[PDB]
Amino acid sequence: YIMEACDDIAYSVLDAEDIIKKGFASFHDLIDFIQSNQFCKEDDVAKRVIENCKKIHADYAQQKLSPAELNDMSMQMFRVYAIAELVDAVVIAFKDNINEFLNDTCEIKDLISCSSGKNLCQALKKFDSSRGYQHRSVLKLELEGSNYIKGLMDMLWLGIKGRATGDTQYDTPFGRYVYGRISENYRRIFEQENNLPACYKEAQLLADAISGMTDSYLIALHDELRALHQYEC
Amino acid sequence: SMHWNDLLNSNRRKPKNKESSQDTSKGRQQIERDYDRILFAAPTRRLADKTQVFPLDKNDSVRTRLTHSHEVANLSRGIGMRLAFELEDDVFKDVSEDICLKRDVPALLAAIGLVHDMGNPPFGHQGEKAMSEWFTKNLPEHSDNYKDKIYGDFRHFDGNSQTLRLVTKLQILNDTYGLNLTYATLASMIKYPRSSESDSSLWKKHGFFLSEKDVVQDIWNNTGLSEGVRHPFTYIMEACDDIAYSVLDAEDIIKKGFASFHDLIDFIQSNQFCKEDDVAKRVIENCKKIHADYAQQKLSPAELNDMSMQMFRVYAIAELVDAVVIAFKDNINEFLNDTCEIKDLISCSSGKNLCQALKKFDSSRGYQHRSVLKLELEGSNYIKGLMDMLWLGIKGRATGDTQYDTPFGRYVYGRISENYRRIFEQENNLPACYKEAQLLADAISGMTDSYLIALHDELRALHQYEC
Amino acid sequence: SMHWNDLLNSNRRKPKNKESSQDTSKGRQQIERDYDRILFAAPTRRLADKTQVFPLDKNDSVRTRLTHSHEVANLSRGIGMRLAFELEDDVFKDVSEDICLKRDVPALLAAIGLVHDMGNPPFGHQGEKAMSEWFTKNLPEHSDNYKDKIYGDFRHFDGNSQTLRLVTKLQILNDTYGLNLTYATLASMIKYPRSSESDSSLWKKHGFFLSEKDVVQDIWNNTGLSEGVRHPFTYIMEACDDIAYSVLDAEDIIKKGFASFHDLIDFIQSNQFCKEDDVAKRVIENCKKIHADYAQQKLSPAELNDMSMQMFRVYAIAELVDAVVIAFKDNINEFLNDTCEIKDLISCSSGKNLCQALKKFDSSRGYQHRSVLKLELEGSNYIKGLMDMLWLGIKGRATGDTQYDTPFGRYVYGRISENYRRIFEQENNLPACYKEAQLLADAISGMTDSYLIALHDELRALHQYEC
Ligand SMILES: [Mg+2]
Ligand SMILES: [Mg+2]
Ligand SMILES: [Mg+2]
């Protein structure tokens, strides 16, 4: 529960900070979104964060700063205040509900919802979704990554399917090379004799191969095998 | 039969609420505010990126949609000032003193001239054809889904209906009011007062879509017009548009080098109907008289051709505008009748032969040039490819079928402008297939040439996996 | 002291000849004919290819020179209609009945608004700087050839003087009359009524070149103005230009994503002079009132920002126009005095603080953006390279020295427009170095950004052998 609460706090705060840094929004936009949010109008944590942010922003505009620098350090202060408040709320909620967490019949979905920073975290998640996750560039790169992943998965399945069931459509040179390109440990685990169904083993091999790759590695492998798949297509 | 009081109605469709501090009207008339709204609208600025006939990338001072619209607006404003300052007694009779003609008529004519080509599809007139062809292939008439005549709105897509939709309903705010223009302006925007559902011989094309039908009815109820009856100022706007077409397209043809001033002079002189036309004779004589003195000075052939065609433009525009004004003044009673059957104002004027000859010259020399045809084919290919690519993500969104749930389909749907999708997702009485086709038409019509090409290339790059 | 009869002179510099069949005036006033001449001029169409502040290649609906000129013309026309239809008694007194104010004043203001940025060099204001810098390096002040103050016309090159030259002398026909505008229009074009030879503290920049000095004198003799005295309508034109700058540049900044509506609201609220300004307070209150209702509906953040800034533009333009009109009406007697010392109309109005804050916001957010600075540097490099490359073929053509006789120099000279070279080769009293520098300035100023880049690349390719 503590790990999930920390992950959610990091998501909600640092993604908003990255959104402001990338120029998809501004500090004043986030302040207005928090102030006008339905559940954050009366939240004590949100009120304190907004007041502290404005108090620091007045003194911050006193000095001679560029708009980018002002936005950056204003969002740094917002990050500090929000992280402090959310961490304190999460710790208090965990301390208060420690008996329920230690029970064998615990039904709490998440620690944040039981804390006082629930509204602020929800508003930050909504802001991140509306401004950052649904941005045009983000959607375009998501589509590109989906295309890359699906192409690589089809190209690997051309050489993986049938390796355990018994059928031998993988014996093409491209299939053998594709199988050889997979990491050795994954194939060693796949070739082991266990009680898993053959189709399950093949699909698990593909999942392990795909999940272990980075973006650059996945793109490079996809391009290389696309170049090498020209004859069989 | 019709009264100028109803034809010049300054009321707006949106009901009145607003404190005095929010009053932005100032000393401006309502129709002047409509003109200002049209000028400051984003599509007006986007019109600069749309080609009229010839490519705009070359620095040959060709006229785009924005320049043509401004020229038409200027001509309409000049005609309006002539009507309101000199021919007021002959034209405007029994007009209430609450209407300031000197401030409304020129502003109204300029506003309707500026907005006449604001909702047209990109890539020029060919674009419309392409759209129609695409719909004719993708909304089959024999199919039960697209059997009704309403889908003709898309099989015979027209820029005027899309312009009315864009100025009345197609805005960011879905208030069904758009720019909230006055009733007189909206009535003058309707070029053909009929829909595809109705069958008429006076008007070939339809002037509004089914979705705007009720709105059009409201306009009629607030203007005194009816189905098949055209607002009197629409004739003036169409005459100005035709004059601008015939003259400035010829000027652009001469500038681009597809012909010369002497070629145009010979074509006009040898034309069957312009051999005895007084207007054509006067234009030719004035052109030759200026050209003799013009060749007296030391000028390059390009410079001589350019300024000779400038003089030709001046003389032709003056003669055609005078003829159009005279024809409108003479036939004012017929225009105000509820049973007016005049097709266009130019045909009733003395500049009919000159305008027809100029249109024939433009068609033979400019519109059928090899480069123009090649770019028209390229634009048609771009439009059809983009339409197929968007239909991959649009079809089934309203009917119920779920073939659009592919990642490419979702991204394609998300690439469409938010206001178009907001209108499409609204719950109305339109058929689902009609709503989907209207969404596609709105998406395609609102794009410029550069934007359309960029989107087509980007989505073609992103469509590689699913192909 | 000055009379509106002389300030609104409808006569033209070109002496009258012409049969009745050649009369193209029709029912148009002379100033209306001037507006039509300006609109149909080739530089007016070429203005669409020149960037105002931001690049025009992107389809972000940014405003170019043509759009900005049309907006300024519309604002000036609105102010003129307000003056001629409502404030006629307060402003126009002792005006002869032969002058139709309702048809001349709006037309005059629109014409001077449309032509105010017609002769400006490409690549925006930075272009001018680049030109000046180039001249400051290539026309040294210490040198005896370029020691006179007249060459300051090129060391402190201004777009207003080039615009006056282009509308008065720089045409295809070298008749020293150009478009042959009326005396009132020409008088209103002169923004700064002084030259570089004269030293004045009221006006920083010079308003006309040496070559046009006599022409300017003639204008004064036919208008009743004098050196250091500015036409009253020039104040209105400058106020409209400043309002359009301050408001529409901020709108373009918000549209381009360099800032947001809330950022502008906070900047206006926290501004030192806008904390207590009534106009700024009213604008902020109206913006927030509309923004609350606007956020009630379901809108994307981009759409909300866009229409919120549209509302801000509407309110700010209304308030600033009203303030400018009130200031002009109140100080009409001082403007008509021969010893007027008012620097600008906005400073005397109540919208001074709002306009200053908007200008500061535009400078801090838009004009000093990284992309804007990079494109300004690129344009400066292009302009300086083209100027050096042209000077290789221009220098010595009039003084007598023959270093230009290289094939590259001859081709470079031939690439210049024919009318510029025709004017340069004319035998006048201007010094040879002044004529050469004026030829270069006319060649550079008349080019668009795309044309300048294309010519620079082509001549760079053709200059490889001689380098
Ligand atoms: Mg995580
Ligand atoms: Mg047209
Ligand atoms: Mg300007």
Numbering used by the authors:
A (entry chain E): 236 to 468
B (entry chain B), C (entry chain A): 0 to 16, 19 to 468
Give me lines lifted from the publication on this model.
pmcDeoxynucleoside triphosphohydrolase (dNTPase) enzymes are effector proteins in animal and bacterial cells that hydrolyze dNTP nucleotides and inhibit viral replication. We therefore named the dNTPase-NTase anti-phage defense system Clover and designated the dNTPase protein as Clover protein A (CloA) and the accessory NTase protein as Clover protein B (CloB).
To test this hypothesis, we purified Salmonella enterica CloA from cells co-expressing CloB and determined a 2.7 Å cryo-EM structure of the resulting CloA complex. We observed strong difference density at the interface between each CloAA and CloAB protomer in a pocket lined by highly conserved charged residues, including R29A, R34A, R38A, and R314B. We observed strong density that could be unambiguously assigned as a nucleotide ligand composed of thymidine di- or tri-phosphate connected to a second thymidine base with a canonical 3′–5′ phosphodiester linkage, and we named this nucleotide signal p3diT (5′-triphosphothymidyl-3′5′-thymidine). No nucleotide product masses were identified when CloA was expressed with a catalytically inactive CloB mutant D71A/D73A enzyme, supporting that CloB is responsible for synthesis of p3diT. Introduction of p3diT was alone sufficient to inhibit all CloA dGTPase activity in vitro with an IC50 of ~7.6 μM. We observed that p2diT was less efficient at inhibiting CloA dGTPase activity (IC50 of ~20.9 μM) and that dephosphorylated p3diT (p0diT) had no detectable effect, consistent with the 5′ terminal phosphates of p3diT being required for high-affinity interaction with the charged CloA ligand binding pocket.
